Amino acid sequence: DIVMTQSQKFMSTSVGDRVSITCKASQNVGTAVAWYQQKPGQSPKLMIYSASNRYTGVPDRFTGSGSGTDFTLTISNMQSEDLADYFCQQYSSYPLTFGAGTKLELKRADAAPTVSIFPPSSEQLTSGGASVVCFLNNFYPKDINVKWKIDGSERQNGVLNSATDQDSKDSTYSMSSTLTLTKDEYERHNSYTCEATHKTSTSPIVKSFNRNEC
Amino acid sequence: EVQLQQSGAEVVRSGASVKLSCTASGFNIKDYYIHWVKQRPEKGLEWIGWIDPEIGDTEYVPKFQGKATMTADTSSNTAYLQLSSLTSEDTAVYYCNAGHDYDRGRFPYWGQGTLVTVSAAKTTPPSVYPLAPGSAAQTNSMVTLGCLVKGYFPEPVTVTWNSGSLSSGVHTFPAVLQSDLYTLSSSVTVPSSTWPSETVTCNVAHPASSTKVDKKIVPRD
């Protein structure tokens, strides 16, 4: 199988920018490559074929180039409607294969996340389980790291992270990080800490609580 | 215009089978090869194979032999994908697309995809826990409250705050699996002066289990 590699999963852009998306083939595919555009829950669409030919109806701001193993999709003067996922595909030979996609996102001003931590509710505790949740809301850019500490010690296991897509209105991202333990594991400790490191601050944002107070 | 319309999302039990449809309008599938491609969460598209609706000839890639069965019918302009002996690994969005039979592989027409979710879990109502902030006397502005919805199957659950009156400032996260059952949280941010003087309740609904739960967030734990 020919591997089509799109090294960039995400790219921040602004309306008016010239944007280029790369795709590398593991074997010589000639110019037998096509590019597709896809938006959430919608059909992919053919944009470029034969590496550099524009498919019927696609606007003249999309062009493609390359051959052999290195290919590039270029959007000149990017428009709002261009924010979407893009993926290359080779049809040099079987099996046909696709790149993993590159998502074009919107650029805005950096914003520091709003962090909040919550202990297990007494109710969940009567159930024998204990989830400690931390929200990291409305930040930009998306690059962020959350660290948990139980009694000042890094906790690797049991945490699940979930992220919302970039907000369609305010262009920020939000995330939830939750540490799930049993009531017994949770009750054998005092200090729980949710720490967020983001480019918006040199001192990570630290939020915590002590079980014996609360 | 030329369009490929696929059937709605399916939540199926492991070991069972499911048959997906892809209907063409504005054009005829006869002179095309209809291909199907799978897309797993956080993963790239993988080709399954094609069918030549004119003769019924099909070609499958080795990973899907005995897993997928493609059929077509040119009079109704519909192609089908049957998936049998389903497992967790078959959970993905499935697309049908079309390209000229004499064409090497350009995919000018694609259906919108069908999400198939496979699990051996039984339908389970969620437990809703209130997320109230501890009594930390440190003086601050805006306050964030939340609700943890845990241990339900299948998706989805819907969550509102104050019956939809509180819409701005809420974040409801994608659900994630924790040993066969789902969990998600929702946060709401309101002015510090308005809570707790004014009630804040999260309304959680889980249509699959015919359950509705309202949790009023009160101070403490």
Side-chain angles (χ1 to χ4, degrees), chain B residues 129-150:
Chain B
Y129 305 115
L131 268 26
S135 69
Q138 297 182 89
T139 65
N140 185 258
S141 196
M142 304 271 125
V143 68
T144 292
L145 311 82
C147 276
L148 207 213
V149 191
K150 192 175 195 284

Side-chain angles (χ1 to χ4, degrees), chain B residues 87-149:
Chain B
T87 52
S88 294
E89 310 315 282
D90 297 303
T91 293
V93 171
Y94 292 85
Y95 295 93
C96 58
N97 56 31
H100 292 123
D101 57 4
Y102 58 90
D103 183 277
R104 292 175 71 196
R106 297 151 61 196
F107 289 133
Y109 315 117
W110 290 74
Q112 87 283 20
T114 297
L115 169 60
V116 179
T117 303
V118 190
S119 176
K122 300 299 191 70
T123 113
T124 308
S127 295
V128 183
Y129 305 115
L131 268 26
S135 69
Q138 297 182 89
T139 65
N140 185 258
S141 196
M142 304 271 125
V143 68
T144 292
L145 311 82
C147 276
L148 207 213
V149 191

Side-chain angles (χ1 to χ4, degrees), chain A residues 142-172:
Chain A
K142 59 133 59 71
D143 308 80
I144 196 165
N145 249 80
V146 187
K147 184 214 307 302
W148 281 92
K149 277 179 165 63
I150 306 184
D151 276 332
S153 171
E154 189 171 36
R155 179 62 185 238
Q156 291 274 251
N157 315 311
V159 359
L160 249 289
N161 296 325
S162 183
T164 55
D165 284 341
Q166 177 177 42
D167 204 86
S168 62
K169 194 211 53 157
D170 73 21
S171 308
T172 66

Side-chain angles (χ1 to χ4, degrees), chain A residues 48-121:
Chain A
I48 296 295
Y49 67 83
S50 293
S52 59
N53 294 335
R54 194 175 296 110
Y55 187 58
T56 328
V58 2
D60 297 339
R61 67 186 181 273
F62 286 92
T63 54
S65 62
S67 71
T69 49
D70 296 293
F71 303 86
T72 301
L73 168 67
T74 303
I75 312 181
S76 296
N77 198 22
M78 208 201 71
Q79 301 294 297
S80 319
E81 71 184 332
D82 295 344
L83 293 176
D85 292 25
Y86 294 87
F87 56 90
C88 54
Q89 173 224 346
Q90 59 90 16
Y91 48 80
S92 196
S93 52
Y94 287 172
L96 306 180
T97 49
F98 298 83
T102 294
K103 181 185 290 72
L104 259 38
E105 293 186 292
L106 205 61
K107 247 222 286 279
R108 51 153 284 158
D110 295 349
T114 296
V115 190
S116 305
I117 192 177
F118 301 89
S121 63

